[PDB]
Design a protein around this nucleic acid. Structure first.
Lengths: 77, 65, 234, 86, 94
RNA sequence: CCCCAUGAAAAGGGAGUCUGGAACGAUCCCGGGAGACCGUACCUAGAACCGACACUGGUGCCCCGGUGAGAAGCCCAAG
RNA sequence: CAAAGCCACGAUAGGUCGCAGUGACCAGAGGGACCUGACUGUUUAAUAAAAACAUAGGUCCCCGCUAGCCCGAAAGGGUGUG
């Protein structure tokens, strides 16, 4: 139950007028979605720990917009 | 001793000499077979190389392309 | 006495097994029955095997790994089958090749995956023809005899010059055997006691008998030079 | 090449694959295109020379033709359905 | 070929580089184009596609962009050359 | 930058492209309902754990103004 | 950049006291010669830390894979995703 790297330490006092100090533990940042062989996550695509339920806010508006840019694609159509 | 001077006075003069001649061959300026010497070639692992300009990866020897 | 180390190594305990879950996969030919075409999609490092492997995609969508051949690039197109031409990386049949052609990863039958000339830098040449079979000279200088329709790859396994750089210290050899099954470090048998080795015991460390032993010695005794025809440097 | 009335395909953008007709030339980098009756109806806009891929099909119209003039000319060669044949 | 290229650059007008000469090819304002054999594949088949739409001579150079750049005297590589004015040389018949 | 080291796997997430079906209909706003079961006191150690003991041993991990290079030696806050 | 306020480091000139200025604290005695193991590492938990073990380098032997070497009473198995 001591330290574990799978959690980042934060301490807060700048934007702060009350008077105490403590420590908050949050999980490390995510990344643009995963498996791998073609290996390029994208531009304009969104990854968040929770989901704001967004639909077009988390993907571009081209033909294959969320899948990948025009790189690993045209041998699929 | 050249590049082998990072060992100090260990391992023997002739053993350090053989190690040094192999490394000096690896770090020569190599020419890409595909584009040309434009972007320099680097080693990923033993037998795996690529050129940093054309992004082409190929298979070669252990310490030279 | 007590069981030797080689006798303990045969029970296959975790100290003597291979940590194979760390490799990409078995590097064998697949069972296919046509004249296909493939594309190399990656060149990878196989942890304890000494040769890099390529990943191949067939036109019907089949994935497999084979040992890489020197001079093959990613995105290159290769052909598989009896009608394949003589080019690096192509999987051909040994019945169709002329004399003195350098190949590697040679099968013995049709559909075993490849047996000979797989380690880094090794290759075989075509050295003749028997009535039903072709004669292939291996890197040990011996001659082996394989089927007419055994598949092989054209070229030399990548990773040569592997052994021209000295390991230079005991720790460079400590990793090398972390991903292999070889036991390291190695204790001399003369340094043991008489209960643990036929060479052990005595005031002065020495092999007490001649080292050469027969082919019929029971297990627990085959140490030293095994059924040697000759000894000495010359 | 890039000339008046050539049928083209837009390589990128929102539609990115739908077809259009070149009506006139603006400058050395931009041309004006239109697709009258596409599935979404790509509208009269300029486009960069690098963003369209030419086809072998042409239409006989004059420089700076209106939206109706090209619409009739498509029917003249019966290309109204033949846009999505290639 | 080198004999005409020496005269072409002495008196004619020339364009060095892919981007500038690729736009002129689409609008049909280049007399001819020479391509080195080491050019990127995506750009090479773009040259070949747009050339059939305008009947422009295309010459395939055997060497790379480095000994094509050295022929022009330019200190770095040139992979595509666009010929916009022959000048007085006799290169355009190839 | 380095390796004769190339440095886990899955459930669970999101997206894309197609096929079939109905004309009603949300990944957006507003209001309402629901979310089993089990742990949770205290010590965590020169007196709460193991060593016959309120045993100078072992089992712990994580954190903390002056002089000074310093988490050292010396002096002192909060406790 | 230059000015202003804070801050750090490196130097200069003069004056001065003590037995003593890294004033306490912290904090290497040095040199010449021979044997031995090359080196970093390991070991007799509770009388032996070494010149013993290992090591990198060297060299020899078996074996073309339905092999060589080893485990099992058998079915079979480890090296071997080689």
């Amino acid at each position: 139950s001591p330290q574990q790297r799978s959690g980042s330490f934060r301490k807060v006092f700048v934007k702060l007028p009350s008077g105490k100090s403590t420590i908050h533990y949050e999980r490390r940042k995510d990344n643009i979605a995963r498996c791998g062989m073609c290996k390029k996550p994208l531009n304009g695509v969104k990854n968040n720990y929770t989901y704001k339920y967004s639909k077009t806010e988390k993907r571009p508006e081209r033909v294959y917009g969320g899948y990948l840019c025009h790189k690993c694609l045209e041998s699929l159509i | 001793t050249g590049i082998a001077g990072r060992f100090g006075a260990r391992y023997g003069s002739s053993t350090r000499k053989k190690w040094k001649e192999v490394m000096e061959r690896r770090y020569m300026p190599h020419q890409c077979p595909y584009c040309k010497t434009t972007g320099k070639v680097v080693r990923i692992a033993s037998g795996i190389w690529y050129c940093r300009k054309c992004e082409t990866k190929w298979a070669g020897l252990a310490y030279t392309p | 006495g007590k069981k030797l180390l080689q006798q303990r190594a045969g029970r296959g305990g975790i100290n003597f097994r291979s940590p194979s879950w760390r490799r990409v996969g078995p590097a064998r030919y697949p069972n296919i029955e046509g004249d296909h075409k493939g594309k190399i999609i990656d060149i990878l490092h196989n942890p304890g095997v000494t040769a890099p492997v390529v990943k191949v995609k067939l036109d019907n969508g089949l994935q497999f790994y084979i040992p890489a051949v020197q001079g093959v690039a990613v995105g290159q197109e290769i052909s598989i089958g009896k009608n394949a031409t003589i080019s690096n990386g192509n999987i051909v049949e040994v019945g169709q090749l002329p004399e003195g052609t350098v190949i590697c990863n040679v099968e013995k039958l049709k559909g075993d995956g490849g047996k000979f000339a797989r380690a880094a830098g090794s290759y075989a040449v075509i050295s003749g023809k028997a009535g039903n079979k072709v004669l292939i000279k291996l890197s040990s200088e011996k001659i082996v005899e394989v089927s007419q329709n055994a598949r092989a790859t054209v070229g030399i396994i990548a990773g040569g010059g592997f052994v021209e750089k000295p390991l230079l210290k005991a720790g460079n050899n400590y990793w090398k055997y972390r991903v292999r099954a070889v036991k390291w470090p190695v204790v001399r048998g003369v340094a043991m006691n008489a209960v643990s080795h036929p060479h052990g015991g005595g005031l002065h460390q020495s092999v007490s008998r001649p080292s050469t032993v027969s082919r019929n010695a029971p297990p627990g005794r085959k140490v030293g030079h095994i059924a040697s025809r000759r000894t000495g440097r010359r | 090449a890039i000339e008046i009335g050539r049928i083209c395909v837009k390589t990128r953008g929102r539609e990115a694959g739908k077809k259009c007709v070149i009506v006139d030339i603006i400058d050395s980098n931009f041309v004006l295109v239109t697709g009258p009756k596409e599935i979404n109806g790509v509208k009269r806009r300029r486009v960069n020379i690098l963003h369209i891929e030419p086809t072998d099909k042409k239409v006989e119209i004059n420089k700076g033709a209106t939206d109706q003039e090209v619409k009739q000319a498509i029917e003249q060669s019966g290309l109204t359905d033949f846009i999505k044949e290639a | 070929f080198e004999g005409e290229l020496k005269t072409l650059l002495r008196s004619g007008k020339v364009i060095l580089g892919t981007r500038k000469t690729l736009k002129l090819l689409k609008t049909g304002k280049v007399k001819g184009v020479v391509v080195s054999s080491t050019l990127r594949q995506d750009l090479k088949d773009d040259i070949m596609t747009f050339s059939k739409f305008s009947d422009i001579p295309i010459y395939l150079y055997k060497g790379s962009g480095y000994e094509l750049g050295t022929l022009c005297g330019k200190p770095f590589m040139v992979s595509v050359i666009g010929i916009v004015d022959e000048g007085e040389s006799k290169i355009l018949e190839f």
